[PDB]
Each structure stands twice: as structure tokens, then as C-alpha cells.
Amino acid sequence: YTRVVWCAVGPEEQKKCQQWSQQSGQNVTCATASTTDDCIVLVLKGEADALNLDGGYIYTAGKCGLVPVLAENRKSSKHSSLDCVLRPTEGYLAVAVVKKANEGLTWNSLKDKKSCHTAVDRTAGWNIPMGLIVNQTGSCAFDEFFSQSCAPGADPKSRLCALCAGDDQGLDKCVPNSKEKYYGYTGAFRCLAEDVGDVAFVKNDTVWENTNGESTADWAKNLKREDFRLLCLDGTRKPVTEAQSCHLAVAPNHAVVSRSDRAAHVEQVLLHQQALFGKNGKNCPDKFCLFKSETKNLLFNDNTECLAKLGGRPTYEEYLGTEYVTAIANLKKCS
């Protein structure tokens, strides 16, 4: 068998990857790059094997010939006797989140407000909301819609990065990795929690996992769910218990991609590494938990129960689904 070379995005991921590599007896080793697109290039060069990707990045990777291998499966809403690895994935709910106290704001008055996005090119943070906004405004000028934003990966001098904050030192402002304070689901939801933004584009799970004590993180530890509302596309505002009726889209779960030539082996190695380090794995929490990182969603989302086998050996289009593929293609026409 060969070792599998994981690609870690930024130094926090790299630190986790190195602990995993040590715990796996070097069955997994680590390459690191600054951004997800760079990891994708290491994988296309064959200098890394795999990483787990949001569906907007799966589209980038898939256009370049990389293939989905296993998908993130979180706890199911409904009962299933099937093992996690075989239980079908469900898709997460992209939402637009505001503060309850910001009473006047709805979907229809977002123009000129401040927004917080997980990063450019990610599903709930970018492709879904900006694709909807471009379509509804009839204008590709999405860089001018919000007065200011944090949208990691955008030009650091532009309004789309104005609200980003960088790392502890204020370096790396707007870089699309966990060094940036407002990066990712938890960093965009923190951008809203701290009222840096008026709106955060994240998924439903984000709000629940970072409120009412579910996170002990200093910035989250004291947030109340009731202080937040979801923006629905019909212009109404709802409590965050209503995401199933007040979302912008259902997103394909994050998934591992690799070169086609390495997919079989990546899939076999990961199935084994999660038997050891996954949720109730033989060596988690004793030795190392592959799906934990103190809320920071490093390498995998912290809410991942297991990586699950895909039905029908799907291509990346099949995996993402035809509508979402078309939605991205249409939005990408703007650039």
C-alpha cells in the first residue's frame, strides 16, 4: 500500500495533519499550501493525494480532472439502522443569518449592507448567495453590492475584503485559510456575532453549533440563538429553528477528492484511518480524533460522523448535481 499524502490548507490544518500523520504511523503524511486552490494544484501535480473540499471547490477540482472519493456524513435527522459509512448523505442548508436586533433587514434590503462570507468560491458562503444576487439584480457587478464584506480569497484592497481581520498580528488579512479571523463557517458566523457584518452566509448547522453553549470558544461561548434570525427568499425573517423552510439552497456535503488514479487507494486508507480515529474510533478520543479540532473545522467539519461511500461512482457533476453545476457555471460567467 502506499502512504497517502494529505493536503492541509494553512498552518492550523498543517499542525492537525502532522498529529494525524504521527498517530497513523506515517500511513498518512502531509503537504501544506496557503489556500485550497493551491492544494488542488499540489494534488494535480501529484505532490499531494487528497483533501476534503467544499462543493464550490469540488467544482474547481473536478474541472481539472479530480474525482470525489468519500463524502462527509453528519448525524442524520431521521432514523437509519445502516452504518454511517453506508447511510445516504443529506446535504446541508445554506442560510443567510442576521441579528434579531437588526430589525429592518430582509433578503430584499441587503444592498449596501456589510456581509460575511465563508470564502469566495465556497457553496453557502459565496456560490449560492452571490449567484442568487447576480440573477435577481440582473448584474454581474456583485463586487459592488454590499458596501463592505469579508470574503476571503477576494482582492485584499477591495471592498470585498474590507471587513476581514487577518491573524492575531493583523497579517494575512482576507487570506482564505483559518489564519484569517473571519474565515470559514465559524469565522463568517463570528463576523456577524461581533456585528462586523450585517449578514453572514453560512449553513444552518453553524448557527446551532456556535450558540447556547454548544461552543465554549471565547467569542461564541455566550451567544444566544434567539438573538439571530434567518433571511428567507420571500422577504420574511424566521427563527433559526426554521431553516428547512427558510434556506437559500441545499448544498452537496463536503467530500474528499483525489486523482482518479489514486482514488481507490485513498478511499481504502481513509476507511481504515476513520475506523481508528473517527467518531467512536478505536483510538479516539484516547489518542487522536480525526473529526475534532475545537470547533475550528480543520481538515474536516467538526460535525462529521464518518466519511461515507458514494453511490454510483459519481463524477464530480453527478456528485454536485446538475442544478448546482449550472448555478456555478452561470455565476462564473461574471468573471
Binding site: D37, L44, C64, G65, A329, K333
Partner: peptide, 6 residues
């Protein structure tokens, strides 16, 4: 809506 970005 075509080629690899890299």
C-alpha cells in the same frame, strides 16, 4: 463553462 482553471 469549460477548461481547468490552472
Amino acid at each position: 463553462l469549460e477548461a481547468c482553471a490552472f
